[PDB]
Amino acid sequence: RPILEVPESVTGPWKGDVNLPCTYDPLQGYTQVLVKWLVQRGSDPVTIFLRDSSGDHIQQAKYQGRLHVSHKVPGDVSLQLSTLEMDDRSHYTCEVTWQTPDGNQVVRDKITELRVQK
């Protein structure tokens, strides 16, 4: 522990919307300092979303205006993608970094496969 809770795969309808669940149980002392969602490009995970102390940042142009990440509940950083294209099919990684009172950082990630249907 901690671990992220992310399904092995999700489906979304072509031209519709999809939610990629990424949840965790908040732990006493583990302050969330970074959230990233990444898309797998061969051997390279590529950041598409970053949440840091300055706010939310969409890091790949093709997701601009189509990407939201939950923020209202501690431990729910699920990703929502709208107007799905067939070219959105990929493996997506949820990655959360926590910092403990001593300054140590702990990182966890987990992969889901997004399939776009119909």
């Epitope: 671990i3 051997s43 493996h91 990684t93 992969i111």
Partner: nanobody, 124 residues
């Protein structure tokens, strides 16, 4: 997903063994695979891991330069070549599978599937 280990047994210090682990399913390449070990009276500890996709490899510091992990995705098989074996390497070795990518591969809670283990004994 079922995981089945092969290999193991008795070897002399300085010798070597190859362990293997076969996985069911059809999405093997997207799983990170790991090896863990447990000696009697001690807790289970990380040995090596290999990431999904590009297959980055990670090793406990005490096995770096001695053990090598690799995978054959067309065979759903992960291998552990344990060279330069020492009596301190005596333990039951377990293969495991999870959906981590670059982080958390040392944390046993990050692996959802486990084999029953194979015993390795290194005699001096």
């Amino acid at each position: 997903v079922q995981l089945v280990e092969s290999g193991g047994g008795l070897v002399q210090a300085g010798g070597s063994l190859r362990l293997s682990c076969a996985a069911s399913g059809r999405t093997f390449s997207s799983y990170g695979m790991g090896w863990f070990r447990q000696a009697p009276g001690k807790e289970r500890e990380f040995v090596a891991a290999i990431s999904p996709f590009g297959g980055n490899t990670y090793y406990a510091d005490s096995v770096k330069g001695r053990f090598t992990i690799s995978r054959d995705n067309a065979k759903n098989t992960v291998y552990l070549q344990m060279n330069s074996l020492k009596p301190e390497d005596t333990a039951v070795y377990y293969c495991a599978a999870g959906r981590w990518n670059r982080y958390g591969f040392e944390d046993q809670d990050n692996f959802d599937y486990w084999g029953q283990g194979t015993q390795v004994t290194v005699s001096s």
